[PDB]
Every structure is written in C-alpha cells, then in structure tokens.
C-alpha cells in the first residue's frame, strides 16, 4: 500500500533526537502527575492520620459524652466525616437511671472502626491506587515505544549499496537507537522510582490507617450482644424461680 509507505516516511523523517526528548518529557510529566496526585496526597494523608491518632489518644480517659463530642468535632474532612457518622451509628450507647434520668454510662462497639474508616475509603479512592499502580507499566511501555521508534528511524535510512554506505548506515542506525535507548533507560529508571515510591507510600498509608483505627477501637468495647443474651437467659431463670417464690 502507498498509505503504509507514506506513513513510514512520515514517521521516520523526524530527527533522531526528538525521540528521546519526547520520551523524557512524557515520562517526566507522568512522574510530576504521580508526585502531585499520589505522593504528596499520601504524605498529607499520613500526616492527617497521625494527627487524628494523637487527638484520639488524648480522650481515652474522658467521659463517653465528652469524648463523643470531641470525636464529632474532630472529623470534618468529608470522607472521614461520613466515616465517623456511620461509625457513630454503629456505636451502641448504654443508658442507666441516675437521678431519675437516662444518661449514657458506657458506649459499646458493634463493628470494628476499620469497617467505616476503611482502606478503600480513606486511602485507595483518595490516591487513585486503582490507576496509579499501573503507571510503571505505562512508563516502561513508553520507553519501549521510544526504542522501537529509534530503531525504525535507523532502519528506514539504511543504505546497503556500497561498503562506505553500509558503514555510515550502521553508524547512523546505532546513533538513532542510542538516542532512543537514552529515552528508554530514563523511562525504566523513572518506572523503578515510581514503583518504590508508590509501594512505600501505600504501605505507610495502610500502617498509619491501621494505627488510627486501632486508636478508635480502644475507646469502645465490643461484645455487647452476647452480654445481652446472657442477661436475658439469667433473667428467664430468675423469673421462673421468682414465679414459684
């Protein structure tokens, strides 16, 4: 086809230096996007999680109402605001009669706080980890495309007619592939760096999210339903005995 020859001569007419610069610029823009949307975002997330954990650890000995109010005032970021609202829906306040009034004496947990302050909600959705975990593969592919493009440029211009032409064509082909591999090696180095930074950041985000949910779990005791069932069984036995008495 003449279309294939036309697109080939169009593609391979670009200067061989424009392949490495294109690969480097594209990989660098992808790296800057990664830094801004994932690395900095995850650093802010970890800082906020540490600060929230410090705040929660400071109301361990407070009254249930006071610490509930403190936690309600603490959580204002939208994702953690909704997470706290659902978690507080999960908490079961136990009332007792003092001075002829119903007041909270103890707050019990029915679900772990990780059910609401989950890894997805607080880390995965904010960091777009469903996308950013595939970025190293994209960078590697861009480097590979750069190398193949440089090789194609070198091969299109090869002239095997005369030995001097053969030598010059070999030199030009190697030079074009060397440019392209400069771009590709930059792409692979950036892929390695992105892999390391991403995996470290996600591991630390999960670590401090676990610490945050651990701080939230320590405030409230679980196992209230079994206690209620035991109380019902005891009440039934006592009711039978008291009926006879």
């Amino acid at each position: 086809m003449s279309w294939l020859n036309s697109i080939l001569v169009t593609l391979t007419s670009v200067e061989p230096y424009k392949v490495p610069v294109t690969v480097i610029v594209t990989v660098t823009f992808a790296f800057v996007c990664f830094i801004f949307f994932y690395l900095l975002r995850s650093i802010r997330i970890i800082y906020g999680l540490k600060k929230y954990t410090r705040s929660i650890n400071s109301i361990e000995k407070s009254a249930p109402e006071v610490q509930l109010e403190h936690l309600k005032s603490l959580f204002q970021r939208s994702e953690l605001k909704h997470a706290w609202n659902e978690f507080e829906e999960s908490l079961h306040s136990q009332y007792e009669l003092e001075n002829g009034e119903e007041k909270i004496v103890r707050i019990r947990a029915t679900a772990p706080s990780a059910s609401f302050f989950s890894e997805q909600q607080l880390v995965d959705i904010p960091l777009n980890t469903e996308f950013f975990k595939h970025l190293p593969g994209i960078l590697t592919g861009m480097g590979i495309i750069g190398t193949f493009y440089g090789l194609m440029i070198g091969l299109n211009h090869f002239d095997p007619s005369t030995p001097e032409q053969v030598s010059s064509s070999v030199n030009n082909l190697l030079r074009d592939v060397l440019y392209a591999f400069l771009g590709s090696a930059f792409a692979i180095f950036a892929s390695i760096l992105v892999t390391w930074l991403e995996k470290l950041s996600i591991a630390k985000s999960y670590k401090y999210l676990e610490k945050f949910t651990a701080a939230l779990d320590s405030l409230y005791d679980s196992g209230v339903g079994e206690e209620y069932l035991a109380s019902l069984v005891k009440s039934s036995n006592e009711s039978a005995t008291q009926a006879r008495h």
């Binding site: 190293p136 960078l139 590697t140 592919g141 480097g143 590979i144």
Partner: protein, 246 residues
C-alpha cells in the same frame, strides 16, 4: 453470630502487571534485530572490500598486460629483432644484444634497435596505462662467471654507460630527433641498474648481454611530488665520457 450475611464482598484490588521482564524482552528484541542487521551488513561490507581489492589487482594486472602487448606489437611493427617477454616484463635483444671479449658497444643492428625502442617506450609511458602504473626503467648487465670478477663488472658497467650515452649523446640521432619534453621524460624513465652474473648452459654468446626491463607501480603505492624528480631544462649539450681510443 450478630453479623449480617448481606455484607460487602469482592474486596480484592487487581494486581498490576510486572513490567520489567516485558522491557527486557522487548529491548532484547531490538538488540537481536540490531545484531542481525550488523551481522549481514558487516559480512556484505567485508566481502565487498575483499572482492574490490581482488578485482582492482586484476585490473592493474590487465592494464600491465595490455601495455606490454601493445608495446610488443609496436616493436614487431618497427623492427623484428626485438624480443619482448610479458611474463617477466622484460624487453631483450635476440642476437643483436651479444657482446665479445673486451667489447663495450653494440653492433650497428644493436645501436639501431636501441635507438628505435626509445620512442616506443615514450609512447608506452605516455598512454593511460603508463600514467597509471609505469615506473622507471632500469638497465641490467650480464656477464659470464669466468675471468676476473672486477674485469667483468667494469666491462658490463661500461656497456651500460655506453648505452646510456647512446640514449642521451648529442651526436646520437635521438637528441636531434627527440624534443626537450621527450628528453626530460627519458631522463625520468631510463635508469642504470646493477650487474648480474646469470651464467647458464655454458653459452658465452648469450650470457654477455644487456636487456631493459620496465617496473610498475603497486596497488598500494602512492604517486607524489617527492618521488617525481624534475630535471632542469637542458642548457648545454652532453658529450659522453668514454672516448673511442679506450
């Protein structure tokens, strides 16, 4: 027992593809193609150099053979006693080149043939083959192995000097026949060589002889002004050094 059976499921983020063996495989694909291309290109180039050198040497040999053939044909056309051997690049004299004891000059036929062969050599060097390959001509002296060695050497060297004079003596017909440019070219071409003692078959008639051979540029030899010694234009006539009463 207090949990809900209608809970969230599929909490499984897909693992990303490992990209580095893919990069290794594709870069070795490119490198393998590069090595194949360099293999075929280098083999073709080296074979082309080898065959180019072979055919250049063959063309130089063919040009030398053509020059020798045309020079021998011209020699036959001019006068028949000339003996030209293309197999060793040598022009000899069949019988006119003989010499007797205590003799240092060719006979009348020998002098005539010596005067006749010079314009043929000038024409041979003039042609394209001469410009491409023709070196200067040396003159070799031959004498029997018997007698005094110094006597034989002096006699043969005197023969060579007499031949050179007959080439360039003013009284010789060549000087009154050739021009200044032809004289300068003869000065460039004709040189005096050594003395050889190739004595065989116990034939003193043919052993004591003088013949001229032509040399040729090699394929790798270079032509430059340093080797091109230019004689100044002739300002005075030349008289030979061996006088007749000798």
């Amino acid at each position: 027992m207090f949990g809900n059976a209608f809970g969230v499921k599929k909490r499984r983020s897909d693992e990303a593809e490992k990209p580095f063996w893919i990069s290794y495989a594709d870069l070795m694909t490119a490198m393998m193609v590069l090595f194949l291309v360099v293999m075929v290109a280098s083999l073709s180039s080296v074979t082309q150099r080898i065959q180019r050198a072979e055919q250049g040497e063959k063309a130089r040999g063919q040009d030398i053979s053509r020059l020798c053939e045309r020079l021998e044909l011209h020699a036959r056309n001019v006068n028949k006693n000339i003996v030209v051997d293309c197999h060793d690049n040598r022009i000899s004299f069949g019988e006119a080149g003989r010499f007797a004891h205590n003799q240092f000059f060719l006979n009348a036929e020998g002098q005539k043939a010596l005067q006749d062969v010079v314009p043929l050599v000038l024409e041979a060097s003039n042609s394209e083959e001469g410009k491409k390959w023709f070196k200067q001509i040396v003159i070799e002296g031959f004498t029997d192995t018997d007698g005094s060695y110094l006597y034989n050497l002096h006699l043969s060297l005197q023969r060579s000097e007499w031949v050179m004079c007959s080439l360039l003596d003013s009284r010789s017909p060549l000087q009154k026949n050739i021009s200044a440019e032809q004289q300068l070219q003869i000065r460039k071409l004709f040189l005096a060589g050594g003395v050889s003692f190739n004595n065989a078959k116990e034939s003193k008639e043919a052993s004591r002889r003088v013949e001229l051979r032509m040399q040729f540029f090699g394929l790798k030899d270079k032509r430059d002004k340093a080797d091109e010694v230019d004689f100044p234009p002739v300002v005075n006539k030349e008289v030979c050094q061996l006088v007749m009463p000798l």
